[PDB]
Design a protein around this ligand. Structure first.
Ligand SMILES: OC[C@H]1O[C@H](O[C@H]2[C@H](O)[C@@H](O)[C@@H](O)O[C@@H]2CO)[C@H](O)[C@@H](O)[C@@H]1O
Ligand SMILES: OC[C@H]1O[C@H](O[C@H]2[C@H](O)[C@@H](O)[C@@H](O)O[C@@H]2CO)[C@H](O)[C@@H](O)[C@@H]1O
Lengths: 432, 428
């Protein structure tokens, strides 16, 4: 299971996992505990599968949006940093990781999507989505293309969907109404329609994913991309002159990225709970840990006031936080994965051309309205956790029965010894 | 839309299938479009729930009971004359709750495929394959590689010693008696994971990696269906198709699939699709056209199977099929397959023990009544989608009714005028 005496850490393959593993060498070269940093596929879906059986990593890194489901499923340990540690991180980053009054993870860095443009194929990035087609017609005349970004994950297409009024769960009076879902409304329809019209007019391709878009931009084949800070590393080494700027407006309104706070939770099945705490607070969440990670793949606007006051002078970080301000902080409520799955389907099926935008989003709206899928999903993981726990109990009872069998055989040995002692003590009394 | 669009999976002979689409277009002039989208079996119900998707969908029969329960498949209406051209047991695979829900095309089963120059005889047992891999490793080769990402391919071994999906007895399936947890399933999956731990296979091998290695002569054995024989033909590896090895002395038990063609319930071209399938595909000419692209296996059309049955590769196919089981077509199959995919991937990667992986899958698959909620979801989507078409029509009707009312105004006023002129005329 989760071997005790070591820390295993999961973080997504696009993050600075090699830089994080350097913070693991320091932990291992300093405290002797070994640290293994892995980047599995579909990490956010494997974690609850294995953690439900007491397996998985000690620490799981993901944006805070997924952690409310992990918590409701009972898979997360209680985070308990001291008030002294709390004043080192911006309070709004602690806000992202608070669910029903408990801190369910440590905030690390603030992520938001920005516009990234090739400084030499385009001297000024377009201020509006609406001008991007004309730019692409011109740019293709030179053998290049205007824009390429990942169309497979709704994270990347939502800023445009949300611009004119799309929303996940209505947020009002400080609370989300999970039956007021806004993926159906006219704003959402107009955004996805513009996107599918871009595809159908041959300005982008529905088959484009993350790898194809990064390859295309870093080779000077596309004028613009949409991505987070992690992507800056690979663009640096391509010797492309790139700028990071505000996302284009749509119908006169800013694109609204959903803002992620990359967070570290501690597996509820971890025996190394306090070892994990010390790693995060006194190794990761410091200038040298964060800088080691950050120089692998930039983290974005880190939550630690100490190192952030230094990264904030990067113009790319300001442009990140300006885009972040125009968007909305993602909810962390359990229904987010259900929301994300509904919107993922819609975008792929509308982009593929085999469903209309109107039909795709009407389906997604009703699906997302079924947010009581997360109750069934949490109950499922809890029923796996229970059966696994009963199984450990039965193993213990076999151990106890074996021991009990040895004991009974020893008591038998003693019974026979006592027979002898009675015999010899009578033999001795008669010599007397 | 006056044309036929068809979905079929990318490992099938879609190029050959399109040739039958031309021969359809040259006779009726109707265009035939053959696409092989990824995850078609999962996209289909998403889009058909809103009245979209393809006209015809090709997949193994196991998925069609869920499509039918969600109300997304048209009732097939073969004439008694046409029904007697197909083996009756292939009709049973596509029969769900008394209705025929698709046309059967071909019977599929996995076989062992081995390099006859790397191996004089296929192994009789799974248990000897490690020793064989060692001997081969010393020569720069490997014993066995097959797709480990899809539970379809690992099931023959999982079932060998007693694993099963849903218990079948008295003619019906008990969807609460699930056999992915039992000692037979565990022993099969444990053997698979030990192969990986001992470096005889790699948990990341998938379909593409395994085919390449075998067709390049890099590995002595693979496990695959008939669709794969074409590419091995063009590679000039000397290969045999044979019965799978035994495990713990018992036959491997592959799940048998009947490639089937369903007709979308929202298709306006239902009769064209019927005509395409009955009188173009399901004939000695059409099945041969597909079969020459990528072999189909044992086709359902008695006339063309009589010829195929002479191919020893088809005999070995049918011998493997007989040791296995025809897959259920019940709605719970998708939940079953997803649960077992999870277990195999998580245990093969080493993140979970076999016991824990399969205990979780057992409890998941035991909740197969997520297919009832899932169908109820698709139906309420279909209903809401339909109500919107209705509301669009009713706007057209009210507009037309307003245009009418305005014309009745013109007529009323003309009659006023006529009254004036006709009395003024009676005075004159
Ligand atoms: O639904 C898409 C996806 O959006 C976010 O995932 C992001 C992640 O937050 C980023 O750090 C980066 O890794 O890209 C991911 C998308 O590819 C949500 O955090 C995630 O839950 C959601 O599924
Ligand atoms: O995966 C290759 C193989 O997959 C199919 O078998 C499926 C089954 O039919 C599906 O419902 C799926 O979810 O489970 C098995 C894969 O794990 C096809 O039957 C076969 O033709 C195709 O090549």
């Amino acid at each position: 299971k989760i071997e005790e005496g070591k820390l295993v850490i999961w973080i997504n393959g696009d993050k600075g996992y090699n830089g994080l593993a350097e913070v693991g060498k320091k932990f291992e070269k300093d405290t002797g505990i070994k640290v293994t940093v892995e980047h599995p596929d579909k990490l956010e879906e494997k974690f609850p599968q294995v953690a439900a059986t007491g397996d998985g990593p000690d620490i799981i890194f993901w944006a805070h949006d997924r952690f409310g489901g992990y918590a409701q499923s009972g898979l997360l340990a209680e985070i308990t940093p001291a008030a002294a540690f709390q004043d080192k991180l911006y309070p709004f980053t602690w806000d992202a990781v608070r669910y029903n009054g408990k801190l369910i993870a440590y905030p690390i860095a603030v992520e938001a999507l920005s516009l990234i443009y090739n400084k030499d194929l385009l001297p000024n990035p377009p201020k509006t989505w609406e001008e991007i087609p004309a730019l692409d017609k011109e740019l293709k005349a030179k053998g290049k293309s205007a824009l390429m970004f990942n169309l497979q994950e709704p994270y990347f297409t939502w800023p445009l969907i949300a611009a004119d009024g799309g929303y996940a769960f209505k947020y009002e009076n400080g609370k989300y109404d999970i039956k007021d879902v806004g993926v159906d409304n006219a704003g959402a329809k107009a955004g996805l329609t513009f996107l599918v019209d871009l595809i159908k007019n041959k300005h982008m391709n529905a088959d484009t994913d993350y790898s194809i878009a990064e390859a295309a931009f870093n080779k000077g084949e596309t004028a613009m991309t949409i991505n987070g800070p992690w992507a800056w590393s690979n663009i640096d080494t391509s010797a492309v002159n790139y700028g990071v700027t505000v996302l284009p407006t749509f119908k006169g309104q800013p694109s609204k990225p959903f803002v992620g706070v990359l967070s570290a939770g501690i597996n509820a099945a971890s025996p190394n709970k306090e070892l994990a705490k010390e790693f995060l607070e006194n190794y990761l969440l410091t200038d040298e840990g964060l800088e080691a990670v950050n120089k692998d793949k930039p983290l974005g606007a880190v939550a630690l006031k100490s190192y952030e006051e230094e990264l904030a002078k990067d113009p790319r970080i300001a442009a990140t936080m300006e885009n972040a301000q125009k968007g909305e902080i993602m909810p962390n409520i359990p229904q987010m994965s259900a929301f994300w799955y509904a919107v993922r389907t819609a975008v792929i099926n509308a982009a593929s051309g085999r469903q209309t935008v109107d039909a795709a989003l009407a389906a997604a709206q009703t699906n997302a309205a079924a947010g009581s899928q997360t109750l069934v999903n949490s109950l499922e993981f809890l029923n796996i956790q229970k059966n696994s726990t009963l199984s450990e109990i039965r193993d213990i009872e076999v151990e106890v029965e074996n021991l009990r069998q040895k004991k009974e055989k020893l008591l038998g040995k003693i019974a026979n010894i006592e027979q002898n002692q009675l015999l010899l003590e009578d033999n001795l009394k008669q010599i007397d």
